[PDB]
Amino acid sequence: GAMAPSYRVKRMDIAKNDEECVVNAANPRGLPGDGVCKAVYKKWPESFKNSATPVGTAKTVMCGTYPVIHAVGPNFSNYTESEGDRELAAAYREVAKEVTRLGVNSVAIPLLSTGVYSGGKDRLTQSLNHLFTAMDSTDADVVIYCRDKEWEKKISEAIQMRT
Ligand SMILES: [Cl-]
Ligand SMILES: [Cl-]
Ligand SMILES: [Cl-]
């Protein structure tokens, strides 16, 4: 575990993280995809061997000794708000189980279902609150990755509001 488990946020490419493992915002089919998923495919292509897994689950594949946790958030274009919310919570619970099993002291994590799977809605608070629900009982240092300056400020405020 980390000596004093923390949350932090950084505004940069999650493919250049400084943590002991990465969470991919994966598609169910293990395809290279776009956005975070395509950056993760370029950096760790070996981790897409048999990475296909259903919505609401996470599947870890090792790139050398570096774990890639493929977490499949729901596409809100296809899911109802209710079922989508349940699957988004479940994906993060499966991430916490994998981070625990791996025994890592740190993990790089994107906000699931906030990009092309958002169904055109702002889901920063929804996704971050499910991330906290899952990861609060873990002792890894969590580093959240985002690309927007306003999102960075809002995620940082949410972290500091609890401290
Ligand atoms: Cl960057
Ligand atoms: Cl997304
Ligand atoms: Cl972002």
Side-chain angles (χ1 to χ4, degrees):
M3 280 306 100
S6 66
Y7 289 108
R8 296 167 57 226
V9 60
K10 297 201 297 178
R11 189 185 73 98
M12 51 184 282
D13 184 358
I14 197 172
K16 303 194 165 280
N17 76 81
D18 195 29
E19 289 70 61
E20 291 184 359
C21 69
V22 71
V23 178
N24 185 26
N27 59 73
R29 303 181 179 274
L31 291 157
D34 314 79
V36 162
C37 185
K38 174 53 62 57
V40 165
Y41 182 72
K42 291 196 186 144
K43 187 55 67 169
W44 305 282
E46 301 91 337
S47 74
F48 289 69
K49 189 171 214 300
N50 293 309
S51 64
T53 197
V55 172
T57 73
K59 179 165 194 180
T60 302
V61 182
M62 307 300 295
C63 175
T65 73
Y66 187 81
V68 178
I69 305 168
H70 299 276
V72 186
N75 181 359
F76 279 97
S77 288
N78 295 332
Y79 284 89
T80 63
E81 288 287 346
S82 172
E83 189 67 10
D85 180 76
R86 189 195 74 63
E87 288 296 11
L88 176 54
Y92 281 117
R93 291 188 304 271
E94 296 303 305
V95 168
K97 294 180 192 173
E98 284 298 283
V99 164
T100 296
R101 184 182 63 77
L102 291 163
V104 295
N105 291 334
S106 64
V107 56
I109 193 163
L111 292 187
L112 303 174
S113 296
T114 64
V116 296
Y117 278 11
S118 74
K121 292 206 179 149
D122 171 348
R123 301 189 181 268
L124 189 170
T125 299
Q126 173 179 28
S127 191
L128 180 62
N129 282 340
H130 287 320
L131 185 163
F132 288 152
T133 298
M135 303 303 296
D136 279 351
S137 63
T138 75
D139 64 1
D141 281 339
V142 171
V143 184
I144 301 164
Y145 284 76
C146 69
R147 299 300 296 269
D148 181 275
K149 289 177 161 184
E150 294 311 300
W151 281 45
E152 182 192 12
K153 288 185 201 145
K154 283 182 268 197
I155 297 163
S156 181
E157 288 166 349
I159 295 165
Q160 294 329 133
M161 275 314 305
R162 329 176 80 206
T163 69

